[PDB]
Amino acid sequence: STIEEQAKTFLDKFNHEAEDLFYQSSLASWNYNTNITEENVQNMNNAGDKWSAFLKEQSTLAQMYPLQEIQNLTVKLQLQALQQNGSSVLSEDKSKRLNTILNTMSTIYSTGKVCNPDNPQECLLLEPGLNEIMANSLDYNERLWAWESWRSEVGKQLRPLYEEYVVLKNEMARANHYEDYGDYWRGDYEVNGVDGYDYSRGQLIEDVEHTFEEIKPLYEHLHAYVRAKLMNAYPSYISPIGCLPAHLLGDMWGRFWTNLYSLTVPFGQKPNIDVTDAMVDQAWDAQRIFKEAEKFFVSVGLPNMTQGFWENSMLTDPGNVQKAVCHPTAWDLGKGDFRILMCTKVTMDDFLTAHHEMGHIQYDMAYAAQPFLLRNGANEGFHEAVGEIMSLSAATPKHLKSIGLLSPDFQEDNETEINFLLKQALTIVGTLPFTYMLEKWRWMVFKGEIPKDQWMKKWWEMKREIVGVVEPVPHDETYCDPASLFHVSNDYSFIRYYTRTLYQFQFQEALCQAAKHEGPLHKCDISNSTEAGQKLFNMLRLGKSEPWTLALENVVGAKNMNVRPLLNYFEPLFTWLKDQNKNSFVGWSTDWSPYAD
Amino acid sequence: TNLCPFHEVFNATRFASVYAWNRTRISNCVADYSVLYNFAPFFAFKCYGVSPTKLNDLCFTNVYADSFVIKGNEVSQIAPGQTGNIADYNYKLPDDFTGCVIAWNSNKLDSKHSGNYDYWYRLFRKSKLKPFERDISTEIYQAGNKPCKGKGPNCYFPLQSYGFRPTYGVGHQPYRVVVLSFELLHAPATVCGP
Ligand SMILES: *[C@@H]1O[C@H](CO)[C@@H](O)[C@H](O)[C@H]1NC(C)=O
Ligand SMILES: *[C@@H]1O[C@H](CO)[C@@H](O)[C@H](O)[C@H]1NC(C)=O
Ligand SMILES: *[C@@H]1O[C@H](CO)[C@@H](O)[C@H](O)[C@H]1NC(C)=O
Ligand SMILES: *[C@@H]1O[C@H](CO)[C@@H](O)[C@H](O)[C@H]1NC(C)=O
Ligand SMILES: *[C@@H]1O[C@H](CO)[C@@H](O)[C@H](O)[C@H]1NC(C)=O
Ligand SMILES: *[C@@H]1O[C@H](CO)[C@@H](O)[C@H](O)[C@H]1NC(C)=O
Ligand SMILES: [Cl-]
Ligand SMILES: [Zn+2]
């Protein structure tokens, strides 16, 4: 009689059909990615086409249930997440225009090529050519050439395409009752109808702004130290008070400063932690690495891996006969089947990545009992954070000594931990202003506060104001330089990394408090504490059926993102850094540029 | 010294689906029960009304054996006084039942690549079933208000499929189930232990 029970029915049918269809599609994707052929491409294409047809059919059918007459919260969330028609609300002509533009962006970004000005037939891709060029070369001119050539080759092509992309995205956002596409992406963190846990679409903006306001001081201090080191290295290219050149940040866009460690290391004579020699000496292989990570997860009380995981997952490069793409990815095929695919090498890097991937696997297995439409993280930012926190825990030298990979005679000291935290800062602190920059720029572009003929002007002005980076070569509005990034050109939200950065350290602080550990957080380990495991599982089982705020409180007891874990975790590095920065200028002037003399 | 077709019931090939549970009638035997032990490593042996070691010392008038296949969780679901989609729409077991249940893992005979779609089960029925009922319905369901005809938007075909494949988890794995029912009622018992 009532409509909510009809929705219950329809969902009961949909879950069972979708389990089988999605299993078929994802198994086709797996057998493609483990074995690169053509007929595998055909099979995965057929499976994905069937899956997409099923999705559009189900959305079209279930759209007739009005949400205003559902009281059960889980049913409401299921039917809402189902009902988002997305692109199909727009006309078919504009829809095919959009998908053609998307494919055009993908082809230009993945196949963009730049040639050196001396040999027209010798040209390089971004990966691995330009990536290696600006990740390994110390020559100013080569880095500048790579940066400028890549940008002038890709952004000029992608500019009008991105303009029409934004136009259609705004149109479809206004069709779906959103003011802008940025609001469409901000809709991910939205919850309603739960007292004491609600969250508005402007609340995310306010929260991220306030958090960046608190996180800035460490950032200008690190900027000053890195500027001093770079001026020491490059006296004639860097002003003591000006912004850093873009092509001197270690990667293609200044995303991470992980590269600049070799030049900015405080103490270059202290040994670094690397148990790769321990890997080879004890003849460790992939099976032993993953059994290690297994017993690591067991130590907190998490279950074993399933027999199918060890049996059928591909734990090594499949030789040379068959080719595979082994970007570290965890696959949740459903029906109680979980898999891992990545080319294991005997290094400590792969040792950490294995723990990260198995953290993903444990997350996926924890909410396996939830229905099909809710088998996902409480929001987008929980999966990768939970993956990275296990790696952070395993990277502690205490665990290495405990598991017999570091000699007990190794002497921990202030210098080594200072080096370690500076590495972690160059990896983590460097990216936060850049992600904030890119996401806020995209947001104000979508909202319309920046007319077309000064997008890039406002972009670089705000960079020199906030991230403290100045371009080495002037650009006009003919460029689409932001599109030179994977995420910008290929339709992904980017505030996810800032949210993940806050979340992982909130989790780490909470669990380390639960583990009754004493001393610096960077030396904290959670192993052999079943209380930590049960605390983790108490949110692991939830999925996304309840508000993400409740899930966060289930772990930390707080209902919002907060910056105290980050600053507390980096505090000793903060006091060291302010100690050094007494004889250097803090802050950056926006007026100085390399090309202004 | 005539024995039951116990081999002929525990070694078939086409155990019917749960929506039509195949019933074999057992009588005029002597009842070897070492075969109830040696056959397969087993996964579940929950006996309710009879001691599982003290069964050879009993005489029964009639005994019924029902065999069908279900998923892993449903094996735990088959029990006196339970709830769920297999215990309320396909098979109901009486609260006063006295017998033993059997559950072992079938991964080599009843399993295939490219999917298996020959088996079915029923998620939709107007009400609850009564103990020991067979119901091969063919009608189309109805929501609460529409005089619908055929497979309406709120009127569905109440049969689904057990997609079976050999790369599935143990929890979703296709177990083989047969249930053994006795009757302790005063009548000439035609089956007894040696
Ligand atoms: C990859 O697929 C090709 C095409 O069928 C096949 O010949 C080859 O054996 C496969 N390699 C595997 C499964 O390792
Ligand atoms: C929603 O429905 C599910 C299953 O139908 C039930 O377990 C849950 O208690 C219901 N919750 C509310 C608030 O109605
Ligand atoms: C499964 O977990 C238990 C509990 O720690 C452990 O004893 C057992 O060895 C694990 N299984 C395997 C195959 O190692
Ligand atoms: C955890 O407990 C096990 C069992 O005694 C022990 O072998 C291992 O060294 C412990 N690890 C830590 C980090 O305490
Ligand atoms: C079923 O019968 C065949 C011969 O008809 C026999 O080989 C097989 O072992 C029997 N099944 C089992 C599980 O013993
Ligand atoms: C069980 O199946 C066999 C063969 O399909 C059939 O001959 C027999 O009558 C069935 N018994 C039932 C449905 O009780
Ligand atoms: Cl850039
Ligand atoms: Zn990951």
Side-chain angles (χ1 to χ4, degrees):
Chain A
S1 196
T2 80
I3 302 299
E4 60 265 355
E5 61 186 0
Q6 312 332 309
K8 186 134 90 163
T9 89
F10 182 76
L11 273 49
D12 216 339
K13 163 75 179 171
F14 176 22
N15 296 295
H16 199 47
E17 183 96 20
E19 287 182 354
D20 195 62
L21 271 72
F22 181 76
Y23 177 76
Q24 292 178 335
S25 195
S26 173
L27 183 62
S29 177
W30 173 272
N31 71 26
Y32 162 65
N33 270 274
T34 305
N35 185 16
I36 300 181
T37 80
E38 177 57 38
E39 305 327 297
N40 291 113
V41 181
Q42 295 297 109
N43 268 292
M44 82 185 148
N45 191 0
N46 304 332
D49 202 321
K50 296 192 184 191
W51 169 226
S52 82
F54 184 37
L55 301 153
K56 293 179 179 179
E57 168 70 8
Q58 293 292 300
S59 185
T60 304
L61 273 295
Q63 183 143 0
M64 51 75 58
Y65 309 82
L67 301 93
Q68 293 82 17
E69 296 58 59
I70 297 89
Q71 282 69 229
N72 192 321
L73 321 173
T74 62
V75 176
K76 223 188 173 202
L77 271 296
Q78 295 165 262
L79 178 138
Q80 183 34 270
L82 181 143
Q83 194 213 49
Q84 56 183 357
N85 57 7
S87 66
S88 84
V89 65
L90 185 60
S91 83
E92 58 89 19
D93 180 68
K94 301 212 197 219
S95 303
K96 56 203 202 53
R97 294 316 306 119
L98 177 60
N99 71 26
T100 294
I101 297 299
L102 285 169
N103 296 115
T104 306
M105 311 305 218
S106 57
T107 72
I108 301 299
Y109 185 84
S110 64
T111 73
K113 294 261 309 183
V114 294
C115 319
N116 68 281
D118 315 304
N119 194 5
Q121 66 89 29
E122 164 189 34
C123 313
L124 281 75
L125 279 175
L126 181 63
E127 174 62 30
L130 300 179
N131 283 341
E132 187 280 328
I133 293 176
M134 269 151 54
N136 296 115
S137 181
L138 69 89
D139 175 85
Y140 183 93
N141 283 336
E142 191 189 356
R143 302 181 65 91
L144 179 53
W145 292 353
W147 193 88
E148 169 67 11
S149 54
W150 190 228
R151 274 155 172 76
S152 77
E153 202 274 330
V154 301
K156 273 163 186 276
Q157 301 183 47
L158 294 174
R159 181 65 186 246
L161 294 174
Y162 183 74
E163 307 185 349
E164 286 90 63
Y165 182 76
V166 175
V167 169
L168 317 183
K169 284 284 174 172
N170 265 342
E171 293 179 353
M172 65 184 73
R174 299 180 209 282
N176 296 115
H177 294 88
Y178 304 110
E179 51 276 20
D180 53 67
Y181 190 47
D183 186 74
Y184 181 96
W185 279 7
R186 292 189 289 279
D188 218 341
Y189 312 82
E190 294 294 327
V191 64
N192 286 295
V194 187
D195 278 300
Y197 292 100
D198 72 81
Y199 200 94
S200 79
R201 302 172 269 172
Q203 193 55 340
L204 181 81
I205 297 178
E206 282 321 313
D207 189 358
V208 65
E209 286 171 349
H210 298 167
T211 55
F212 186 26
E213 277 290 318
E214 271 206 90
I215 301 300
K216 75 201 310 302
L218 180 62
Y219 175 64
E220 69 275 15
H221 278 282
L222 199 45
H223 184 194
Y225 185 100
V226 165
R227 177 179 52 196
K229 299 287 99 175
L230 290 177
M231 181 295 308
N232 189 359
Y234 292 165
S236 78
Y237 290 116
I238 283 149
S239 178
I241 66 161
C243 295
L244 299 170
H247 64 295
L248 280 71
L249 297 174
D251 65 26
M252 192 56 247
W253 317 267
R255 180 179 176 208
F256 305 145
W257 291 353
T258 314
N259 189 359
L260 306 188
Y261 178 79
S262 195
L263 187 151
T264 67
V265 59
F267 309 103
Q269 313 200 238
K270 276 285 186 165
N272 191 359
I273 295 295
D274 48 352
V275 294
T276 302
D277 278 336
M279 295 298 102
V280 64
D281 288 355
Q282 305 174 26
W284 281 37
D285 52 6
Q287 303 253 10
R288 165 169 221 171
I289 296 297
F290 283 82
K291 160 62 53 173
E292 181 47 21
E294 201 146 29
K295 293 179 179 179
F296 175 75
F297 283 110
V298 180
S299 78
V300 298
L302 282 164
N304 287 344
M305 301 285 138
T306 62
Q307 184 60 255
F309 170 90
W310 279 100
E311 182 65 26
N312 189 359
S313 296
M314 187 66 203
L315 264 168
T316 304
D317 194 309
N320 64 7
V321 179
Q322 305 302 143
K323 302 317 202 72
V325 175
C326 48
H327 281 236
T329 51
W331 302 61
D332 189 358
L333 269 62
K335 320 190 97 163
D337 187 351
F338 304 75
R339 293 181 184 271
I340 186 61
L341 183 63
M342 71 85 88
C343 305
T344 56
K345 304 309 172 183
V346 298
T347 74
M348 61 79 71
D349 291 331
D350 284 15
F351 171 84
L352 309 190
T353 299
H355 286 73
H356 185 113
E357 291 307 316
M358 297 182 37
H360 274 319
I361 296 287
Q362 281 323 119
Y363 194 30
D364 291 331
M365 171 185 308
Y367 62 87
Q370 293 291 340
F372 179 91
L373 277 296
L374 277 296
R375 49 198 51 190
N376 192 359
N379 62 38
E380 71 76 20
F382 274 57
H383 295 271
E384 197 70 22
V386 161
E388 201 46 30
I389 187 168
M390 290 314 79
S391 78
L392 200 64
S393 179
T396 300
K398 189 213 295 174
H399 185 86
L400 294 174
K401 287 184 172 191
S402 66
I403 62 170
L405 294 174
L406 183 63
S407 179
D409 290 331
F410 186 89
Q411 295 298 109
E412 293 179 353
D413 57 63
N414 52 1
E415 322 305 340
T416 61
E417 65 183 1
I418 281 284
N419 281 359
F420 191 15
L421 282 71
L422 188 153
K423 194 62 191 213
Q424 308 274 270
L426 272 183
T427 296
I428 301 299
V429 179
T431 187
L432 294 174
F434 204 50
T435 74
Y436 174 109
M437 185 63 72
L438 192 145
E439 190 67 29
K440 164 172 221 173
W441 183 77
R442 294 221 290 211
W443 281 7
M444 91 195 68
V445 163
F446 292 165
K447 193 266 182 181
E449 293 170 4
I450 306 299
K452 174 278 191 176
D453 62 352
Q454 76 273 23
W455 293 341
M456 182 278 288
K457 193 42 63 182
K458 177 68 177 178
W459 187 44
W460 277 96
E461 283 179 351
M462 185 179 288
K463 273 164 291 163
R464 55 189 60 102
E465 299 146 29
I466 295 298
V467 65
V469 167
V470 58
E471 75 280 22
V473 171
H475 284 178
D476 52 5
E477 302 295 332
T478 63
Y479 297 79
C480 198
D481 291 331
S484 82
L485 183 63
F486 184 11
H487 300 68
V488 176
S489 49
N490 296 114
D491 187 40
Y492 319 119
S493 67
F494 205 50
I495 195 167
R496 67 184 68 188
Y497 290 159
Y498 186 96
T499 61
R500 180 182 61 83
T501 300
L502 276 294
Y503 289 153
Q504 73 201 110
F505 285 154
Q506 269 276 350
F507 276 74
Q508 173 84 90
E509 190 277 331
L511 277 296
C512 185
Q513 183 283 0
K516 187 64 69 178
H517 162 258
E518 324 292 344
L521 302 101
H522 75 268
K523 294 182 184 293
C524 192
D525 176 317
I526 73 173
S527 65
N528 281 340
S529 167
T530 56
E531 160 177 311
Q534 63 84 30
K535 176 37 55 183
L536 183 63
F537 184 110
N538 265 4
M539 172 285 278
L540 274 158
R541 94 181 61 71
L542 268 60
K544 55 183 284 170
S545 65
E546 320 95 340
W548 63 270
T549 56
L550 183 63
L552 183 63
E553 181 194 71
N554 217 17
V555 162
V556 298
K559 298 176 176 167
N560 213 343
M561 301 195 328
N562 201 291
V563 297
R564 303 320 310 112
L566 187 72
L567 272 183
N568 270 343
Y569 174 60
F570 273 24
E571 163 148 14
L573 183 63
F574 183 70
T575 189
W576 181 239
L577 183 63
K578 59 151 171 283
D579 177 273
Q580 279 67 240
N581 273 327
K582 60 196 170 307
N583 296 329
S584 300
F585 182 78
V586 297
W588 52 95
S589 66
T590 61
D591 57 317
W592 178 89
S593 68
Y595 64 91
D597 292 330
Chain B
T1 60
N2 297 326
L3 277 296
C4 294
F6 284 166
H7 313 155
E8 301 56 19
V9 62
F10 291 167
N11 214 50
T13 70
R14 190 60 64 199
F15 302 78
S17 296
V18 68
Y19 90 100
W21 40 274
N22 192 298
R23 165 174 280 190
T24 45
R25 204 291 301 290
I26 297 169
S27 299
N28 64 15
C29 290
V30 63
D32 52 349
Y33 285 160
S34 70
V35 299
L36 182 83
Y37 174 24
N38 62 7
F39 178 68
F42 265 48
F43 182 76
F45 205 92
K46 183 80 161 194
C47 292
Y48 299 101
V50 180
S51 178
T53 181
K54 300 289 94 176
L55 74 166
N56 182 11
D57 186 74
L58 278 301
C59 287
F60 297 154
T61 70
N62 262 205
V63 160
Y64 298 99
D66 296 330
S67 55
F68 44 87
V69 297
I70 51 175
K71 294 162 41 213
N73 191 12
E74 295 75 342
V75 163
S76 163
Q77 197 183 165
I78 291 176
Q82 284 286 294
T83 179
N85 271 358
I86 196 66
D88 207 7
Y89 293 107
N90 279 316
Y91 192 102
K92 172 142 178 68
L93 188 136
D95 177 62
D96 67 338
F97 164 70
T98 61
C100 296
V101 309
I102 301 299
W104 75 97
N105 197 352
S106 176
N107 294 324
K108 281 76 180 176
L109 324 172
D110 193 359
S111 71
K112 54 172 311 293
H113 295 285
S114 68
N116 192 299
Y117 283 30
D118 300 6
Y119 303 71
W120 311 68
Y121 73 113
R122 264 191 61 210
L123 294 174
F124 299 95
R125 293 182 183 174
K126 175 63 61 53
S127 166
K128 311 216 168 284
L129 294 175
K130 287 176 188 182
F132 283 121
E133 273 281 28
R134 293 275 328 285
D135 215 3
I136 320 183
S137 89
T138 56
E139 192 46 281
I140 301 299
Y141 182 76
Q142 185 62 256
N145 298 111
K146 181 69 176 177
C148 82
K149 304 296 187 291
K151 67 181 178 67
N154 77 78
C155 295
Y156 324 110
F157 183 77
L159 277 296
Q160 313 303 10
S161 182
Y162 272 121
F164 285 172
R165 272 162 171 152
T167 54
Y168 282 7
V170 176
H172 174 66
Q173 197 57 350
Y175 284 134
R176 211 168 269 185
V177 172
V178 64
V179 63
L180 200 52
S181 185
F182 321 128
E183 62 182 3
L184 291 176
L185 188 152
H186 313 293
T190 301
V191 179
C192 288

